[PDB]
Subunit: 111 residues, 2 copies
């Protein structure tokens, strides 16, 4: 009983389809774990996303990870309230869903 | 399930209900239905089994049983320190995640 495990954020492309994945639509939550970047969830202004795309640094090619239907929530910002959408990755177990929700809620002021 | 603010308060804890003194620990909680839902405790202390929480109506007080703690290290300015994370008995994994993700944000986790 001792407890590791860091939660990082890169920006990334996302879209309603795979070829629609464009231009850093979003913020991906991830872990470094195992054989590369392991993505937990996406944060976006956009409400209609189905995929996220991650070119591998390998150079093999690209990963598309399917998104779950999003949560609506509202944050207080210096520019007033902004509505964002949180997308868990298809089949995220609950511990990992809990990590994302808890980090948001700890760092971001919510209406 | 959308995110809920997770707050921190000071609280008493101990090896037994009676031994819950002045404030030993820091509890992580939600508000909900008026009931503060306590999720976990943080303590320097190694040997805790119970936390105590006076309901703020002064109707009474709640003792919630703690799980066996996790050791972890935060680094403070006087070097690394060992603290213990106590989930509440029966906390589901979702809320375990929440606590762990809030720990990373609120505590210098070395």
């Amino acid at each position: 009983e001792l407890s590791p495990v860091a939660l990082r954020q890169m920006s990334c492309a996302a879209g309603t389809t795979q070829t629609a994945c464009t231009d850093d639509n979003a913020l991906a939550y991830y872990n470094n774990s195992k054989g590369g970047r392991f993505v937990l969830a996406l944060l976006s202004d956009h409400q209609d996303l189905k995929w996220a795309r991650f070119p591998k640094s390998d150079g093999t090619g690209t990963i598309y990870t399917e998104l779950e239907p999003p949560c609506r929530f509202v944050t207080d910002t210096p520019k007033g309230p902004k509505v964002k959408y949180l997308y868990f990755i298809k089949g995220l177990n609950n511990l990992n869903r809990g990590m994302v929700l808890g980090s948001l809620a700890a760092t971001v002021r919510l209406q």
